[PDB]
């Protein structure tokens, strides 16, 4: 049906191919402290691309935008059509790069019109935010040297060509040239330091002891702006909120106990957050959460610990690790753009990516963890430790049927760990580890224990398939004895040899305990073909590190 869509925009108007791209993406995102900051920043990025797109839509129509496909785009439904949209709207699913069919004469003004609208809105927000941080100097907070940072920050490169998949190729590399040619938290002047202030005097002024620049102020305000433009806010506020979803711990906790813990936490103070389900925090600190010079009863603390600890002996210890899942398509730069072909095929692909990202990835994540972003062939999610692998694979299969292949970094991490770093490492797994294998179609799973230890393992998607249905998974104590032993041998390498090492080790860990040993060796061998590695030592290392991680009793209690 999208042929008769293009015939219009191609015939009805004197047609010129316009292209949008907002430049600060991976930076703006990684500069975030708490999970909310990461959602807020990525979501806004989408907001911008929406206001960029809004202009195209307003002046013309939706079918004039090739990429992304605007059918089912939750922002538009909610915002442009005033549809009564549900929690869909919390997920950011518009990417930066875009492609529209524009009328030759508008091409010039549409460029400046997009530029203004972004600035206008960001400014519009900075203000609204300025008011909010006052609610919870303030005249000269809107100096036209701070206004600058806001307008100057996000760069929106816009380019066009008249009327071939070659024109598309010429539009991209022409476009990808204007890009580069066009403290707080982050290399940007703080909203007070840039004029004349001491760093001691600076920190004192700011609401949480950390001084913010204008951009990061917009980050903080956005979650309340959204709550009052749409209805709702992120379901899992903290990283800890998603960490406590491991084997329904929180839900189980919020029945047997929960009311009594709330009660217990009322009579210590008014902590009316999630950290407090951990015994550790009640001993470890609380000082920080004391925003007032009031008194804290100590028996209440001592016997909040006792309550929780006894809770833990009847329920299990509370989960303290969570997953960062980042995903990205392979060999698809030139597919999204259309060089590898505009015919309706380029729309078809756009619709395929739109559909996957909006519906299929959400149906996979599905209140079982936080889907921050799905731009077509790329995903950010915070997951519980026991959903990471399961979600990743599920999503991979789906992107299968809807481009072709897709890699992934998963970073399991202790909750108390700096996000900026965690987010950085997860990215690195995906880009520097995963995407650098020959047949780049791989899971790069990493585990960083609070110890400082950092196990990584690079794996084919087929491995998780084989491993579920594996006899080997069925037993993993015996496992603790097995895996550690193997990993020890392959710390350097078994001088005995790799094959004979596994035999002796499978052998070591009455009618059926011959066929069983013989089955495991087979699987263990089968599995290695799916570990990405350049020799059996690397492959063995790789599998038994995947084994090591999946089974770790501190991460998976
Ligand atoms: Zn900042």
Swiss-Prot record:
Residues the entry annotates as binding Mn(2+) 3: 328, 377-378
Example of a GO cellular component annotation carried by this entry: cytoplasm
Residues that bind Zn(2+): 185-186, 213, 216
Main location per the UniProt record: cytoplasm
Transmembrane regions listed in the UniProt entry: none
GO MF term (any one): nucleotide binding
Subunit structure: Part of the type III-B Cmr ribonucleoprotein (RNP) complex, an elongated RNP with Cmr2 and Cmr3 as the base, with Cmr4 and Cmr5 forming a helical core along the mature crRNA (39 or 45 nt in length), while the complex is capped by Cmr6 and Cmr1. The 5' end of the crRNA is bound to Cmr2 and Cmr3, while Cmr6 and a Cmr1 subunit (Cmr1-1 or Cmr1-2) cap the 3' end of the crRNA.
Protein name: CRISPR system Cmr subunit Cmr2
Organism: Pyrococcus furiosus (strain ATCC 43587 / DSM 3638 / JCM 8422 / Vc1)
Included range, full protein: 205 to 871 of 871
């Amino acid at each position: 049906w999208t042929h008769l869509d293009l015939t219009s925009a191609l015939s009805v108007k004197d047609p010129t191919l316009l292209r949008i791209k907002i430049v600060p993406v991976q930076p703006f995102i990684a500069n975030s402290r708490k999970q909310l900051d990461l959602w807020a920043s990525s979501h806004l990025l989408s907001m911008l691309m929406y206001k960029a797109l809004e202009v195209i839509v307003d002046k013309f129509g939706p079918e004039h935008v090739i990429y992304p496909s605007l059918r089912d785009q939750p922002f538009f439904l909610k915002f442009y059509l005033g549809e009564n949209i549900g929690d869909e709207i919390l997920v950011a699913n518009l990417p930066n790069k875009a492609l529209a069919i524009v009328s030759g004469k508008e091409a010039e003004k549409i460029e400046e019109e997009i530029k203004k609208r972004i600035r206008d809105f960001l400014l519009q927000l900075y203000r609204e935010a300025v008011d909010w941080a006052v609610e919870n100097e303030k005249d000269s907070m809107l100096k036209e040297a701070y206004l600058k940072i806001v307008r100057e920050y996000f760069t929106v490169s816009i380019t066009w060509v008249s009327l071939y998949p070659l024109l598309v190729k010429i539009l991209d590399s022409l476009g990808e040239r204007k890009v580069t040619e066009e403290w707080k938290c982050c290399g940007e002047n703080l909203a007070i330091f840039g004029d004349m202030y001491d760093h001691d005097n600076l920190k004192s002024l700011w609401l949480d002891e950390e001084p913010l620049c204008p951009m990061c102020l917009i980050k903080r305000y956005y979650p309340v702006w959204i709550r009052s433009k749409t209805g709702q806010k992120i379901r899992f506020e903290s990283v800890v909120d998603v960490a406590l979803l491991y084997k329904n711990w929180r839900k189980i906790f919020d029945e047997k106990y929960g009311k009594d813990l709330v009660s217990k936490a009322r009579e210590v103070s008014e902590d009316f957050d999630s950290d407090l389900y951990y015994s550790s925090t009640w001993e470890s600190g609380l000082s920080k959460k004391l925003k007032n010079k009031k008194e804290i009863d100590e028996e209440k603390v001592k016997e909040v610990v006792d309550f929780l600890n006894a809770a833990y002996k009847e329920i299990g210890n509370p989960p303290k690790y969570y997953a960062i899942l980042v995903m990205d398509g392979d060999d698809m730069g030139k597919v999204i753009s259309g060089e590898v072909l505009t015919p309706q095929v380029h729309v078809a692909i756009s619709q395929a990516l739109a559909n996957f990202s909006i519906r299929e990835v959400r149906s996979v994540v599905k209140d079982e963890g936080l889907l921050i972003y799905a731009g077509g062939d790329d995903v950010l999610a915070i997951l519980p430790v026991d959903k990471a692998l399961e979600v990743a694979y599920k999503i991979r299969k789906e992107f299968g049927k809807s481009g072709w292949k897709l890699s992934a970094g998963i970073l399991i991490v202790h909750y108390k760990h700096p996000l900026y770093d965690a987010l950085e490492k997860a990215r690195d797994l995906l880009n520097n580890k995963a995407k650098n294998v020959p047949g780049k179609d791989t899971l790069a799973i990493g585990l960083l224990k609070r110890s400082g230890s950092y196990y990584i393992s690079l794996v084919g998607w087929e491995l998780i398939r084989v491993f579920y249905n594996s006899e080997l998974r069925k037993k993993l104590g015996v496992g603790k004895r097995f895996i550690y032993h193997v990993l020890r041998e392959v710390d350097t390498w078994p001088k005995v040899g790799i094959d004979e090492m596994l035999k002796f080790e499978v052998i070591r860990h009455k009618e059926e305990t011959k066929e069983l040993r013989e089955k495991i060796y087979g699987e263990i061998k089968d599995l290695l073909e799916h570990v990405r590695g350049n020799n059996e030592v690397e492959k063995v290392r790789g599998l038994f590190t995947f084994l090591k991680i999946i089974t770790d009793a501190e991460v998976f209690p």
